[PDB]
């Protein structure tokens, strides 16, 4: 209600969320890799009933003139009137977009894949990536749902080989699919929800992140290479306060890292 402002926090003052969580709660984390056949690389991750599936299709193009032989990676973050009636009935939404790039900036802050490998014919051929992720049910950390929907959707991508014979392009489906998709770095993103006096919760919910007062997400490589930091105005802060987020974020990182690493031998081969 327009009233319960503190109510929600009542749990908070006595640290606890009406969700039954507290300072850090990687709730329901689930991924379905390659769940999309009609797509070379996909990953569906639903956390606390929010669904961002990363649907990746690959396409062949032509690396820029300036950037001669440079690969091609393209993302799109969309949200229809699905994930929440409280959404528009047309072109991209204010935030809808910010994320779009977020992943992208991440994609570019991450170095996940070197454009080098995307070029089909260094200088006249390139590999295009369309990693479109869509939140089926919106409610909480719409931000993380992607770092994962995407990170996993990629490992799910696999394509044949590249060949040019007498002014033609030869690549067959049943060709040689090697290095399908592998990134030397698998950083992930996490979202904390904060409250004025910095009493912050993690993996905010649709409502939790709502009456929030500050949002902050952090992406870090495996080796702990702070990909990018995001803070759409966070009431102000403390390096130390941030320090907690700093390290305690790492933790939820290993978890997901394992959450995915666990789909390696099981849901990957099953």
């Amino acid at each position: 209600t327009v009233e319960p402002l503190e109510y929600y926090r009542r749990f908070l003052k006595e640290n606890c969320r009406p969700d039954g969580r507290e300072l850090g709660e990687f709730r329901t984390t689930t991924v379905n890799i390659g769940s999309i056949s009609t797509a070379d690389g996909s990953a569906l991750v639903k956390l606390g009933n929010t669904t961002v599936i990363c649907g990746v299709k690959a396409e062949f193009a032509a690396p820029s003139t300036d950037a001669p032989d440079k690969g091609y990676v393209v993302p799109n973050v969309d949200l229809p009137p699905l994930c929440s009636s409280r959404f528009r009935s047309g072109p991209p939404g204010e935030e809808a977009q910010v994320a779009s790039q977020f992943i992208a900036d991440v994609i570019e802050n991450s170095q996940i894949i070197q454009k080098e490998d995307l070029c089909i014919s260094p200088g006249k051929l390139v590999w295009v990536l369309y990693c479109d992720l869509i939140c089926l049910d919106y409610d909480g950390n719409i931000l993380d749902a992607c770092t994962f929907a995407l990170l996993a959707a990629l490992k799910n991508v696999q394509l044949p080989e590249v060949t040019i014979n007498e002014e033609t392009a030869l690549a067959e489906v049943n060709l040689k699919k090697k290095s399908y998709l592998n990134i030397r770095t698998h950083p992930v993103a996490t979202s904390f929800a904060v409250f004025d006096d910095t009493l912050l919760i993690v993996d905010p919910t649709g409502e939790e992140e709502h009456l929030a007062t500050g949002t902050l997400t952090i992406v870090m490589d495996e080796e702990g290479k702070l990909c990018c930091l995001h803070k759409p105005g966070g009431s102000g802060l403390t390096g130390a306060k941030l320090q907690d987020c700093m390290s305690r974020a790492v933790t939820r990182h290993k978890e997901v890292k394992k959450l995915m690493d666990e789909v390696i031998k099981s849901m990957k081969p099953k």
Binding site: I36, T38, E59, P81, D132, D137
Partner: protein, 223 residues
């Protein structure tokens, strides 16, 4: 490869799935996944319904990024005209409800997959509908002489000797929406799918009304 002159793939449906939308719907067809988020009644002398169509920007092998206004223009519209008689309108004078549906995948008949999935989010939501709207796929093999099929595959409907997809309301057998672009047969030769049509709905009419209660229950039993 080929199969029965009426075989059905596996029918999987769990609705209410959507926790954000009031009415939820989902589908499966060994290749199709169609989600439907419906929105209550709002004002914008007896209002009507709003429905929308979209196809995943990765629904296939190729990548259709922009919400193809033309593509969905018809797919959403006809869909609207189809599901359109299904709900009442007098309980929503000066009102309008919206229905949204996306096709993550196209298992040949994914067209009806939508006409179906949507139906769920409706009552799933619990609207003033009358009958349920049932749609299916029906194709005519490439066969020499008239070789006919019932509900094609993404691999199958592409080599069709004609193109059609039509729906109807079981219980009261009501012509939902019949849409096919003639290619083979005479005005009568079409009775082929038309009669082969009432089969499907009656057929799954239960398998459908069943998955609704399942959730309606899990929810009903929930609180």
């Amino acid at each position: 490869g080929t199969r029965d002159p009426t075989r059905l793939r596996p029918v999987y449906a769990r609705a209410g799935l959507l926790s954000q939308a009031k009415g939820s719907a989902y589908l499966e067809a060994g290749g199709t996944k169609v989600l439907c988020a419906v929105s209550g009644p709002r004002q914008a002398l007896r209002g009507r319904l709003l429905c929308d169509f979209r196809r995943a920007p990765f629904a296939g092998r190729r990548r259709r990024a922009p919400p193809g206004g033309c593509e969905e223009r018809e797919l959403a519209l006809a869909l609207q005209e189809a599901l359109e008689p299904a709900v009442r309108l007098g309980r929503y004078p000066r009102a309008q409800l919206e229905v949204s549906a996306l096709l993550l995948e196209d298992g040949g008949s994914a067209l009806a997959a939508a006409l179906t999935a949507a139906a769920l989010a409706l009552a799933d939501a619990g609207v003033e509908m009358y009958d349920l709207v049932v749609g299916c796929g029906l194709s005519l093999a490439p066969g020499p002489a008239p070789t006919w099929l019932l509900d094609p595959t993404r691999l199958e409907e592409e080599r069709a000797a004609a193109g059609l997809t039509v729906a109807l309301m079981p219980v009261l057998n009501q012509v939902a929406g019949l849409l096919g672009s003639g290619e083979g047969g005479l005005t009568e030769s079409w009775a082929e799918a038309v009669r082969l049509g009432l089969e499907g709905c009656q057929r799954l009419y239960p398998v459908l009304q069943q998955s609704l209660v399942r959730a309606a229950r899990r929810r009903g039993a929930a609180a």
